[PDB]
């Protein structure tokens, strides 16, 4: 339905699958279903339902073997949500999780862009104790290297 150049009625159908209670194999298939519910919600711009559905996931699970692309898309979707909402420190934290993902560590740009956006989203937050702590943590981090006219 979503492929069929029509989306207003796309989110509705899939926003009826409680893969939490459907009683399936393990936390792979249902994580995928929840994430596609979320993707459809973002596509239709239903941010309240986006947050509510995202609350169904437990990020602690993503410390597992195959849990790489699923958590990557999880954080990317949360980041779309927050970017259209207005928060910036939350977007910082989400990019930080993306960067800390072991797979994301590999390949040059897959971490260079992550750190670029992490630093900008630290900078684009209000001056609070939390923002100051994040500024300190991202400060240098060794790997921040001397990205030209950037770490300065």
């Amino acid at each position: 339905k979503e492929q069929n150049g029509d989306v207003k009625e796309a989110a509705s159908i899939l926003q009826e699958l409680q893969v939490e209670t459907y009683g399936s194999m393990e936390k792979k298939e249902r994580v995928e279903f929840i994430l596609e519910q979320m993707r459809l919600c973002l596509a239709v711009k239903d941010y309240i339902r986006t947050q509510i559905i995202s609350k169904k996931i437990n990020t602690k699970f993503f410390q597992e073997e195959n849990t790489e692309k699923l958590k990557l898309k999880y954080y990317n979707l949360m980041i779309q949500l927050d970017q259209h909402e207005g928060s910036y420190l939350s977007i910082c934290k989400h990019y930080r999780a993306i960067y800390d993902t072991p797979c994301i560590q590999a390949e040059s740009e897959k971490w260079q862009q992550a750190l670029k956006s992490v630093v900008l989203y630290v900078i684009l937050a209000p001056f609070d104790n939390e923002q100051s702590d994040l500024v300190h943590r991202i400060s240098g981090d060794k790997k921040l290297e001397e990205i030209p006219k950037y770490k300065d």
Partner: protein
Amino acid sequence: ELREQLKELTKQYEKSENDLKALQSVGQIVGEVLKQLTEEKFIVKATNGPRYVVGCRRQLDKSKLKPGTRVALDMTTLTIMRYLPREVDPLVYNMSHEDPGNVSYSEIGGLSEQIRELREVIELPLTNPELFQRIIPPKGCLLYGPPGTGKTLLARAVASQLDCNFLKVVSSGESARLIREMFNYARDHCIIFMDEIDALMELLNQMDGFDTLHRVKMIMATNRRLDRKIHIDLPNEQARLDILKIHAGPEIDYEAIVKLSDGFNGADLRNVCTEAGMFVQEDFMKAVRKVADSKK
């Protein structure tokens, strides 16, 4: 030889001299602060009963001694020398102070309808309560019908499913007061399980229903806010086979057994294996003979 000899003799000399050192250490008096007088004074009740206004050792710091803080009172000057953790008395696990303890989820073979119902009962509040705040999460529920066929087992499995550990309690005036008092630690430890409500000349145990940190719920269960009713059937339709199999720690035989056995739980299979042992597969008709023999 010198290395080991001198190593062991150094151990022995150090131990002996430290024994002499210990021989000049005086014990303290174990007691609890009561009221925290002017910040240089505390009313402390020693174990044997007597209560003294006592000092506060400077390096000890303050604000860590509040009414009930075990302290090591100085034996003569009666000064609070250094605090202590709360002693664990036998009145903890018998007072139902157990957070952990679970067996499995597959241990409950069938029961799918009640599993799903209680799941929808207790998950969402332990997980997202903000949705409700957008109003009051349900607090209690009921497990009902026959003697709650696998009531505590239902809790034992679905709590593990939800990842919140446990707070079990039995309901078999002072007792009521303290049962509500340890609610502080209960929340500090979730699904609360005040079971055995039946069997009541007690009147302070009323449903006080205080306010605690959001999340954490209860499944208060009995027979005959908290708005649920999980009716249960003492047998199952065709899950007696299932109960036997998932209890078969030790199948046509399993059918032939359930086809005439009508009990309430896996005690049937427990008796099967037990009497077969008196008389691992190779049992077969022995189970049938048991189930025919059990009286109940």
